[model samples]
Target chain A: RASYSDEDLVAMLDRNFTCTVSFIDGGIPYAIPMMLASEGKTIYLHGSMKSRIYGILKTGQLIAISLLEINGIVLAKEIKNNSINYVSALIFGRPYEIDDTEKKIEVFRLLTEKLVKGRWDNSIKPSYEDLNGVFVFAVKPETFSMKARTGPPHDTSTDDIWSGVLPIQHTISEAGENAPEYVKSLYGKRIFI
Target chain B: YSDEDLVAMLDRNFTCTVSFIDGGIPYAIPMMLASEGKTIYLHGSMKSRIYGILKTGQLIAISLLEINGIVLAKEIKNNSINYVSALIFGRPYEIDDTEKKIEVFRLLTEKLVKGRWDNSIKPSYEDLNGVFVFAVKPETFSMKARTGPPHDTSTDDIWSGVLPIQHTISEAGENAPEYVKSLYGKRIFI
Candidate 1:
């Protein structure tokens, strides 16, 4: 079985900020991109209660959630040996339905701050109705697995061809100084990378 | 999808790669990743396959390939989004029989080098005997993408311009014969 270091898994989770939340809907599979945050062992996802997904969660069914980050591409000579190198985590757990308003606010603050530092206070705060209209679920990570592959292709002696791993790096740069005044005012410093 | 377009995209599977770790050491394997109009396929052996390393109880991460263009926004508040990517989560299933392995080979080759299987020499029995194929029955997958020019406001002072870049190669004429002439004839050079 594939095993990953905790550091590597955490790095992957931090780098790949988005995840696919999967759940069954009427015997059909559905997956959606979700902005996520993790504190300790529990991962949190919050969304509008009106969303179709929230309805599915209401049934208390088990769910699968995954976060992945691509580090590079491995090119193999033989078609059968080809695979991509990446870091990813899969969580299998029942989601906890969050209801406390004070806790919800704290989680919301954490989520927004994680995405953009200092934007939570600068941006408009959610109204009471907005808070009530949304649903928040946290996965306790009952069983989790992290897997990763990095650097170069492995072609056995039987296979002869050119093979190598091309490093694929995803870099995020500062949006620069010409940003809007509101943005500049909100973020008193240069944009975070 | 056009046969030509599909072939080009299939060939571009060389662009995005998959990585997974086994026994604590990381192994990154490049796939001649390919897609038919319907199913996306990658091939490997059951015993030695990196994907096969992901056993029944293991979790495997497969990313759908993409190439990022450039930053589309100038401010962190309205942060730029420039990447196009898809992540698929599943466990790789080993295809045991030789017949199933050969069938996967045919499907993958046809998807990748359209019509090349028929045009070139077919795989001999010996070739078929030596390979193993694993298919990722996608449990769940997602496509997250962003593109286009920066949206800096008129009053903002930062210099903003698009870095219009496309993933390309220098081997322009490698696919074409010297006898072939004309732009239309060179179209297959990709």
Candidate 2:
């Protein structure tokens, strides 16, 4: 049987880079976008301690996170047949606070380096007081699902109408000279095409 | 903050991630949106399950975000992405009037292709008969943003700058419309 591996999940998570997290507050569901990074089975999230999201996470409630990558806008000959090419994932997890100072610092490093590799060690480090001002949390996904769609638009009518994929490309701006090698490496690089 | 800022943010991007309670779980979906003043509009097939959820008058939360750049600070903890984001909490109301539905359709189309709606095919009443359009006026909303360079310490050895990220449209190949081609090299971010 063809089955998905953990790598399959991780690849989607790594590719998306950001996620929309949903949580219940006073019987209403709320969602927001935030930077996302993962290590093995655990996902890490952090923000200002005063943020309402951290307050809700402290109560130990299940939250849903959605990650998606849009590959292209599929232009079909018919309006009903038009669609988007994408890969998306939905994760259900109960977030738990990470209180240990050492682990919190490490998580910060992981989150930062995910944006630019090898820059964590090269950058300034956080102090104990700095760490105290923010909240860190980890989530072990209780349930997760991944869905994907790629390739060209589908249509039965072979009419002489325009049909093609309008690809979405994300790229980094050019880093001027004197920037670090690691920083320069990402300049003009395609995050995804 | 200013409602104008929220309107500008909502207008710049064509999609918003909306969340609501469904089956005792927090369900979220990204949907195409258009806005006017304090109102946000969404449309879908009449038979859509999401349309049913909104028809129940349940509260929905929406999020719109634009990542500006990668901020490299002297310290790892200070490193972040410059971004503009907004959160909206609202209740959905269906627009049954044919005139209003057509107005929303124009707004949505123009939001995507600037002036494409006027130049292209206009939907007939039969075309819209199977579509369900709705409006959401926020009961409460908030906007947050971070811009400019990263906050870094005065360390001579550390490199610090904002590496901007751009979401640019590529040139459409084959037999594409002129409006579609006009969108090429256009930056989605404000």
Candidate 3:
């Protein structure tokens, strides 16, 4: 009964935009954050071919990828029972190796441009060595599911403890604006919020 | 490091503490929210414990257990990065008895009650049997946290400082009849 529709999944993915990839080695698990991009049914991630993850992917090992976007923390009356509810998805998939230089370059461009559209044109383009050093892999999703726990804690109707959802938002002050020179050089006066 | 310190961090503030068995192998995962006294109670399916190596006694490491606010630090060399996290180390005690399990449920209710569990719905035999609760009596624990602005004075060319503080705002939704409209007007400030 707890599941997310494809539309919901895509929306959540786009909103959160980043995912934490968790992997195991020598019986110890590690989690790291990376920019996530997906097209159709496949997920994409780019990094160095010399990286440990690339090696594991090359060996055809299954990696567990988890994406979590915390909207806010739920603070209940009792500190001990207070919890956080979030929208998360975990995918268990094996990545397919992508070695074609042209394809790799295209994928890199798509990734960079997705985050900041048009900025990739103004920045340094990837060179031949850069393409050679970098690796791109696509995780053909085997099985994936999204879970969400929203609103307030399940409490009794009669029990009137101070219960409410503590909504949070990421706020940036006007002073947080980028340097005028960089803004002018990068976007010609069009900066993102 | 000490038992008291560990209990304080574990009980005071943690949204969802993740527990992974054997690093890469993740079995039992739950969104837990409470630590009653020295015991940590995690609510999951009755058969959820079946997924993990939940012996009578086992130790587990839980990470990212707290948020020490957010820091927007300025730097000279690169752009700003917002950093926030908390970590806790401890071993959990497993609870298996039906009566004790109900008590754990009560502790969970009391956690939200401010003290209203007695007035709430009493757990039925089926509800008690259906839920699986784990109580980890922490043997030892320690917490590490970092907050505040960035430090990037090394780069003389670029002026850098933290720009944004991430917060959550509420959207319009169904509300109680007695609740005032103003109560739901603005976003929930965490």
Candidate 4:
């Protein structure tokens, strides 16, 4: 129940990697999870031009994106008081696709660099034809809400019952023993603060 | 985080993002999830508007995703996440029978923390009334997964592999229960 600054909310997006994007279609709401990148006021997403989600994104209808990271499990004596510690952010905006080839290449590089630090210079850039096959969309947050909960469970029990928290840790490590130095640098990196 | 089957994917994840049409606009909320067979169960406050919308026979969308790792590719376009995800669609029906309610509650609890249901106190009738449970039998569902390393590319000079993402129960509070401490350094259900 604490107030948060704009930077605090943006920090949530930086810590979390995936978001569940929801949009309405024929009176039915469809949701899908996708990896996203954010910088300043704009949130960027990309998909194949023929993808269904891209078709919906082109419609310019209302879009809701949610990012959540669970930090711990609160074990309370009573079921009602049991909860989980998490930091979540919801973003609502109508996404507009980037049609300019130069703009598409720029956003793609930004997204790639954000996801994998220092990889853009070392990796192959997307060609114009490759960019033509995909649609890169941007969402400027029209409305944003950030919520977070931390610490132990709230219980008023006086009986001899156990209640506390189990901290959840999400770590990033090199997948293989022979992984490259760039990949090995990510070992023991914890994302959920 | 790797799941070979749909049910295993659903069981390994704790919360799902449920989307429903409310007032002609799309709305989403995270809810605790549990599954058996193809049946998915979600519970929340009795006063939740989502529960009310579910009772109208409206179709609901559920998405469960687990990010296994960050897939680094030689080309920026090929970079992606190694993840297991599912999109499920169905009309949910409430579970009202008292006995059936308790059974589902136990299942939900055990899913969050294995064996915690048997160790904790049972839910009272009032507690049952305070919470509403529903089941969705997935009229239509699609499971999508991408695992292992990145795709091969001609740009071999750039290093490419996976940065594995792991979720573990790393620590317990000072006053934590004995069972919780026993779960230290183990993978978490949430």
Candidate 5:
């Protein structure tokens, strides 16, 4: 069962590479995936300026977003006890556009650093072209909650079948030749909690 | 720019969250989906809110994402993700034929369980009767991605790099049904 306080929410949001935001119009609903960054107070997301997602999100319609981390598989003898071990969260908010080019770049900086740590400062600065193609928004969540589900399978305490949780993990791998030798040294750096 | 190599991508991982509005409150529910061409198949208890809404033939959204790697910006100002993601729009069509439902199960089992369903411990007939499956066909979809290497911002010894993300499976399920054990220890691509 999902249950968590906001303190655990940051940890849940910290583990993933993407966030899916859901919105609606004229009775049709949409859930779209995009790059996400969170700093406890607000969430940052980006989309192409020409994109439909950017168009819809900018309307400031009521929105919902979620992040999921599948940590393990709970395997037990009984079927009902079979489940997945995961950490998840849901947030509600209406995102407002950060249309200023400089602010967009700054947000991009924080967003990228949150993801890869060292890449932005090492790269060529984005020309005005780079900044104009995206729509960046700040979502100061109206309310949020995160949940974690772990441990071994349920309903198997008495049976003692060979039940256990199979652990699954995602960690950083080699950066390949695209990065500097110094960057290569940074391989396998575990970023997720 | 996203030009998806669909077949290879499908053999990758699957995780998604869907959204719907009810009484002005937005609900985002995590789900697992199976895709065939432009169509998607997902299942849930017939009593769930998702089923209740889809049964009414309302439209919905489905997003499939694969996070390739994180782009580490040297300046912390140029940070961006290196990844592939898609936004899809669809209207649900409830599948009712028993055989079609069974086939959907087989297909779903094939994708998620990776060929273990046939030999897996059989399902109780009563169990099969409780779920509802929805086949959602997207009217339109668009994909976008950012995949680039580290940028050189300064002359310092700052080691800028990308931390690649890989999807992998854990060891076999010891107490799992016999067939499921076969999927153990196999690695998955994102």
Candidate 6:
């Protein structure tokens, strides 16, 4: 189990996705999930300006960023060895609110295109007030490391033990609203991979 | 949104990650957790760091999260995600009695594999040995989520909508165990 290199960390961070952000207020740790984006050594977190998570970050305190991509549930012979294959990373840093509007919009664009392709094209751009209501915080991680486990279940040879991994994945549903023709055209196949 | 409705958000018992303060810095790692009532049951090796910090009586925050999908809204500001996340603060103590350990172990195993517990061979005292099951009942917690459509569809004329999110498991466990086979058809999330 060797640790990932810094370059590898950045690549995974770009897969940034969602993370539970833990920050201290009044001596107790409070956490909330956040959508994050990363470029180089910088980590960008998104939230509403009026949100509690934003309130905590404004104080310039050090925060913990924890994110996990749960790949699958491995049902092994041993419950102890029965585990979920996942990639998880924990990073710590002090957050500074990004006050620049242009950078905020760019970050938002990258984030959008990262997940929902062609979304930035179809959607209307944020009005000035819309930008004002958003908060983008950038943090250069003071420390970062990723832990990952993948493979067949441990104790694979145990007699008669069911030893296979069940892969898990997230999918976007129609939510009763048909996906716009544009969206379906760009990514209907659930990422041809 | 009223805070109570937020409290009603779903619980993801599959995974739990806890962060602790060490050397004035926070450290976090993930582990599986089983939820029942207000208590979260988790298991770990006796040699795990969880045991090291649980003994400290420090205030710890453990989080459970389910990420459903990526939201693409009309406005970049309103562009958000749909997820259910719970951050609970509590102190955990280990369960050491053999019978009680076995009890917690059974429940945890069952949570991992629902119908498999009673059907599979019961664990001997040694089976539960070298493992630590701990209980953390939170007195204070917070639940928050963003699971709605884009509120402000700007003049951009893009698709203004919500893409509901879901997670599903593969039927790859057919040969793993009797319970795993039964779990083959179950898919989680709304």
Q: TM per model?
A: 0.59, 0.90, 0.62, 0.92, 0.78, 0.87
Candidate 4: docking tier: medium
lDDT of 2: 0.79
C-alpha lDDT values of all predictions:
0.53, 0.79, 0.52, 0.79, 0.68, 0.70
Cα deviation of B130, candidate 1, in Å: 7.5
Docking category for candidate 2? Answer: medium
Per-model TM-score of chain B: 0.66, 0.92, 0.63, 0.89, 0.83, 0.84
Q: What shift in Å separates residue B114 of candidate 3 from its native position after superposition? A: 9.2
What proportion of the real contacts between chains A and B does each prediction keep?
Answer: 0.00, 0.66, 0.22, 0.81, 0.57, 0.62
Per-candidate DockQ versus the true complex? 0.10, 0.56, 0.19, 0.68, 0.40, 0.57
User: Considering TM-score, where higher is better, how would the candidates rank from best to worst?
Assistant: 4, 2, 6, 5, 3, 1
lDDT of 2 by residue, B1-190 (tens): 6988888787787777888898888987777777887799988898879989989988999888787788888877777788888889999999999788888877876676665555544566787897888899999998878899887667558888899888878877745777688778887767
Query: How much does each candidate deviate from the true structure in C-alpha RMSD?
Result: 9.2, 2.8, 7.1, 2.6, 4.4, 3.2
lDDT of 1 at B97: 77
By DockQ, the best candidate is 4
Docking class of 6: medium
lDDT of 3 at B115: 42
lDDT for B63 (candidate 2): 84
Ranking by lDDT: 2, 4, 6, 5, 1, 3
Model 5 Cα lDDT, one tens digit per residue, A1-193: 6665666776666655578777776666767677777676678888667877777777888788888878776655554345567777888898899878998878776766565455566655666787887788899878887767778766624543555676766766786676675467557654445
Task: Write one digit per residue (lDDT tens) for candidate 1, span A1-193.
Answer: 3664555555555544456676666554445556667665667877767788888877767777766555443445565454556666776678878888877877777765655555555444555766787788887766667766766666664533445443433433334467544334433231111
User: What clash pairs does model 2 have?
Assistant: A124-B74, A124-B75
Quality of candidate 3 docking, DockQ: 0.19
Worst 10 residues of 5 chain B by lDDT: B1-10
Question: What is candidate 5's lDDT per residue for B63-125, written digit by digit as tens?
Answer: 667776766654444555677766666778888776777677566556665544444443455
Better of 1 and 4 by lDDT: 4
What is the fnat value (0 to 1) for candidate 3? 0.22
Q: What are the chain A TM-scores for all the models, listed individually?
A: 0.80, 0.93, 0.77, 0.92, 0.88, 0.83
Model 2 clashes, total count: 2
Expressed as tens digits, the lDDT of each residue in B103-185 for candidate 6 is 76576666666765654445677877787777888767777676765676346556566665556665773445566666554
Where model 6 places Cα greater than 4 Å from the true spot, the runs are: A156-158, A174-182, A185-193, B1-12, B119-122, B153-156, B173-178
| True lDDT of residue A101, candidate 5 | 95
